[PDB]
C-alpha cells in the first residue's frame, strides 16, 4: 500500500481540497485586520438579548460547517467510507474542523476575531453568558498562532482532525485506520520536506479540542431550557441535528447525497 508517489499526490489532494473548501479567503482576513469594531457597535452587541446573540452564532457556526462537510466530501478517502462512519466522523469532526480553521480569523497581536464584517475582542460576546467557553475558544486559537501554520500545514492537520479511527461507533473501523495512515504520512511528508517537524510536539493535546466541543454542548442545553422554542424555530436544522440531544441526520444525509 501507498508509494511515495501516492502520498505526494495525496498531499497536493488534500490541500487543493482545503484551499477550493474554505468559508474566507485569508488574505482578505488579514487585509481586514485593521478594520476594528467602534465601542458603540462593541455596546450595541453586549446590549443584545442573549437569544438574539446565540441565534447568530449557531448561525455563523453553521455557515462553517457547510464548507467543512464539503472538505470531507472533496477529501480522498471519505466518500468511500459508508454513510454510518461519514455521518460518525462528521457529527464529531466538524465542529472540530471548525476551531482549527477559526485560528485564520483570529488575531494574536490585539486579541481580536473577525465577526460580522470587523475584528472585536471577547467582550462583544458578552450577552451569550457563557464566558469561560469564549475564553477556551480565544486561549485555544491564541496557541495556534503561536504554531505560524501554513495554509498547507492546516489542511493536513484538519484532514486528520477529521479522519480520526478512533470515533465511537465506527463500523469498518480498519477502513478509517488506513486512510488515517495515509494521511499522517502525508502530513509528516510535507512536514519533513519544509522542515517543520518541530511542530508536532507543539500541536495541542486531543483533550482540548474534545473539552470545547464538550462545553459547547453543555452551555447549548443550558440556553435550550432558558429559551426552547428560540431553538425549535430559529436554530439551524443542522445545527439542532449535530449539537441538540442515516437514522437520526437526515440534514446531513441529504448534504453528503449531493
Ligand atoms: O472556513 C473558514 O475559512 C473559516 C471557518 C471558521 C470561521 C469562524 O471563525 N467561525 C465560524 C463561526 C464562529 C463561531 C464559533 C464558535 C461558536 C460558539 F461556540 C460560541 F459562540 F460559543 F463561541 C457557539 F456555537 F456556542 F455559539 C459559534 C460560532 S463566529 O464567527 O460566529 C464567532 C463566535 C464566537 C467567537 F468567540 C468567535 C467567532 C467562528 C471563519 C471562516
Redesign the pocket.
Known amino acids: 500500500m501507498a508509494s511515495l508517489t501516492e502520498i505526494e499526490h495525496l498531499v497536493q489532494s488534500v490541500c487543493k481540497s482545503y484551499r477550493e473548501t474554505?468559508?474566507?479567503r485569508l488574505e482578505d482576513l488579514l487585509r481586514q485586520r485593521s478594520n476594528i469594531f467602534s465601542r458603540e457597535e462593541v455596546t450595541g452587541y453586549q446590549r443584545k438579548s442573549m437569544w438574539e446573540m446565540?441565534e447568530?452564532?449557531?448561525h455563523?457556526?453553521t455557515?462553517?460547517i457547510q464548507?467543512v462537510v464539503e472538505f470531507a466530501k472533496r477529501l480522498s478517502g471519505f466518500m468511500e467510507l459508508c454513510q454510518n462512519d461519514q455521518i460518525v466522523l462528521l457529527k464529531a469532526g466538524a465542529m472540530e474542523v471548525?476551531l482549527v480553521?477559526?485560528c485564520?480569523?483570529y488575531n494574536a497581536d490585539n486579541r481580536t476575531?473577525?465577526?460580522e464584517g470587523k475584528y472585536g475582542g471577547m467582550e462583544l460576546?458578552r450577552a451569550?453568558g457563557?464566558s469561560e467557553?469564549?475564553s477556551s475558544?480565544?486561549d485555544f486559537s491564541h496557541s495556534l498562532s503561536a504554531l505560524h501554520f501554513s495554509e498547507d500545514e492546516i489542511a493536513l492537520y484538519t484532514a486528520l482532525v477529521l479522519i480520526n479511527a478512533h470515533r465511537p461507533g465506527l463500523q469498518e473501523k480498519r477502513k478509517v485506520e488506513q486512510l488515517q495512515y495515509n494521511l499522517e504520512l502525508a502530513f509528516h511528508h510535507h512536514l519533513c520536506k519544509t522542515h517543520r517537524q518541530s511542530i508536532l510536539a507543539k500541536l495541542p493535546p486531543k483533550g482540548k479540542l474534545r473539552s470545547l466541543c464538550s462545553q459547547?454542548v453543555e452551555?447549548?442545553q443550558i440556553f435550550q431550557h432558558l429559551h426552547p422554542i428560540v431553538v425549535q424555530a430559529a436554530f439551524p436544522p443542522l445545527y439542532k441535528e449535530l449539537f441538540s440531544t442515516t437514522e437520526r441526520h437526515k440534514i446531513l444525509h441529504r448534504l453528503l447525497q449531493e
Open positions: 474554505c468559508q474566507l446565540w447568530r452564532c449557531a455563523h457556526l455557515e462553517a464548507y471548525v480553521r477559526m485564520r480569523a476575531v473577525f465577526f460576546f451569550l457563557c467557553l469564549i475558544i480565544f459547547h452551555r447549548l
